[PDB]
Design a protein around this ligand. Structure first.
Ligand SMILES: Nc1ncnc2c1ncn2[C@@H]1O[C@H](COP(=O)(O)OP(=O)(O)O)[C@@H](O)[C@H]1O
Ligand SMILES: [Ca+2]
Length: 359
């Protein structure tokens, strides 16, 4: 039998078969129900029918908060995207770091009681990303759609006391760029327009090695300008917007938040950990999630952590090309191991013991 891997993303579901190199299904973590009851849609079909539906994010901040809609996302995943009978496949689910214990239990209860999977497992997203980089010790920066975490990991296990959470990720950067471009005179307010600005963000944005220098260059030449044709036929040119957008990850004050930036959350996370493991964390900073895809983010992180860390500390930022899917790939690996097969919670163990078995 083939095991399934479902990464329950704040913005995107990544689902597929354990052993595959990439998720076969990548779709928005969105459920749409009729505006007027006289039934649900999920993912791209929900967005297409948005004019007749109310759209909701059941996993908006990395934590599943709407269980009836998460049921719909999982039903869509099994039956519409992967086209499998869930009762025929062990299923690996991902959870956010600091997922409440009752939340993990509800994920377990739905898998067995609603979908009758024969076996399941819940793994921490950041832990899977570390495994996908061939490591069991290191500190992950996972920046997705709705949340960013630092997760220090030692000998295979997250250190929950040192986890840092930043309520700032890719959704917030798209919102910032929407606001910036709207103020420039291009109206970007609707769902369809959010899609356009997201596309501009992913194609043209980058992280400046030195913000102040990059601003001086954009102020004094056209050399950083990039153009993008909108659906209405207008050509928009952006310059400093390209790097002011993701600079928000290092200066959350750009969108009015008092939070530490990702360089300070990474450094604080490491300093919460055993002094004796900090050398290994500094040398093994892995970046995961779509919001770490910006060109220049690894060099910027190298520079910022160097300025914060002891003068002699060896600092390595690992940014794999496949890091949009590294949480999913780490699940594909773990669930493929012979040593993992005894780790599955079976439906039989669930029927004997109930949801508290997941711990
Ligand atoms: N090349 C890219 N550059 C910048 N942001 C990107 C890129 N590719 C994807 N993203 C952003 O990453 C987010 C989705 O990342 P992902 O790790 O799937 O999030 P989640 O797991 O929380 O659903 C979106 O905000 C998307 O716009
Ligand atoms: Ca994620």
């Amino acid at each position: 039998t083939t095991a399934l891997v479902c990464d329950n993303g704040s913005g995107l579901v990544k689902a597929g078969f354990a052993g595959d190199d990439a998720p076969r299904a990548v779709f928005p973590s969105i459920v749409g129900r009729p505006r007027h009851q006289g039934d649900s849609y999920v993912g791209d079909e929900a967005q297409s029918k948005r004019g007749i539906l109310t759209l909701k994010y059941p996993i908006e901040h990395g934590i599943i908060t709407n269980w009836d809609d998460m049921e719909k996302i999982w039903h869509h995943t099994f039956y519409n995207e992967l086209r499998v009978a869930p009762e025929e496949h062990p299923t690996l689910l991902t959870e956010a770091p600091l997922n409440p214990k009752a939340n993990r239990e509800k994920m377990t209860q739905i898998m067995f009681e609603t979908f009758n999977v024969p076996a399941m497992y819940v793994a921490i997203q950041a832990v899977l990303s570390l495994y996908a980089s061939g490591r069991t010790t290191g500190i992950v920066l996972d920046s997705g759609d709705g949340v960013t975490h630092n997760v220090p990991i030692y000998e295979g296990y997250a250190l929950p006391h040192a986890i840092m959470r930043l309520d700032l990720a890719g959704r917030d950067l798209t919102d910032y760029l929407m606001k910036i471009l709207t103020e420039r005179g291009y109206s970007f307010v609707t769902t369809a327009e959010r899609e356009i600005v997201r596309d501009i963000k992913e194609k043209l944005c980058y992280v400046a090695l030195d913000f102040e220098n990059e601003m001086a260059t954009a102020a004094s030449s056209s050399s950083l300008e990039k153009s993008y044709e909108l659906p209405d036929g207008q050509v928009i040119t952006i310059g400093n917007e390209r790097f002011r957008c993701p600079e928000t990850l290092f200066q959350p004050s750009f969108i009015g938040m008092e939070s530490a930036g990702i360089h300070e959350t990474t450094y604080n996370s490491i300093m919460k950990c055993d002094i004796d493991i900090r050398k290994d964390l500094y040398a093994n900073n892995v970046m995961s999630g779509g919001t770490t895809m910006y060109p220049g983010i690894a060099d910027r992180m190298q520079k910022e952590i160097t300025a914060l860390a002891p003068s002699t500390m060896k600092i390595k930022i690992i940014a794999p090309p496949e890091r949009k899917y590294s949480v999913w790939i780490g699940g594909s690996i773990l669930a493929s191991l012979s040593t993992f097969q005894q780790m599955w919670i079976t439906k039989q163990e669930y029927d004997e013991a109930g949801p508290s078995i997941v711990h």
